[PDB]
Amino acid sequence: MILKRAYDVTPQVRGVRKRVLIGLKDAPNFVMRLFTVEPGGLIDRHSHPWEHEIFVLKGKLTVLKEQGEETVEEGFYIFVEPNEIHGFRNDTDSEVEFLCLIPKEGGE
Amino acid sequence: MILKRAYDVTPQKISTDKVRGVRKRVLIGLKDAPNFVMRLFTVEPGGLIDRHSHPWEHEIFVLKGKLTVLKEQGEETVEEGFYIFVEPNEIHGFRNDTDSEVEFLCLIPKEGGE
């Protein structure tokens, strides 16, 4: 068993930190990442052939969709099916943070 | 794409010979997810998920409060902002020794169900 404070993980888009908290180094099936998006930060719209499972931990996250956008806040979860267009933007003055998990096929 | 408030998922009371004072939400389940499941557990004050093991891993992120982790031997406390990886078939359990509810995310691969 591994027990650790997330922020202590060294990080691996604009104005992002990406931490792989539980990577395939340790885990057999899926990966736990922590994303910190600075004010004005951006993860461009993209597509990958694997799903995302996300939990918004802090702040107000703009979710970029195939068409248009939606804003969610801390305490929201997000499921993105494989190949669905998605991106993320921080349109606030405050740090945004979210947990993001992907299956092994997505690497880290 | 699904975007929803976690708390809006109806929590189910979990009550077994080895679990007391616990509620569980399945946030992203096998209805939607092809590979692994996102749960949110709420442990009331004094609540207990006693030591057990399963042939699948857990990936945990603590959302709220101080979580006492029962390890193969002894215990260790973590808090909001900690993650936990539990290997398959490793003994583990959880206890809430505080006076307020503790919450954590807990993800398992599909072979573990929901």
Ligand SMILES: [Os+3]
């Ligand atoms: Os993506």
Ligand SMILES: [Os+3]
């Ligand atoms: Os378990």
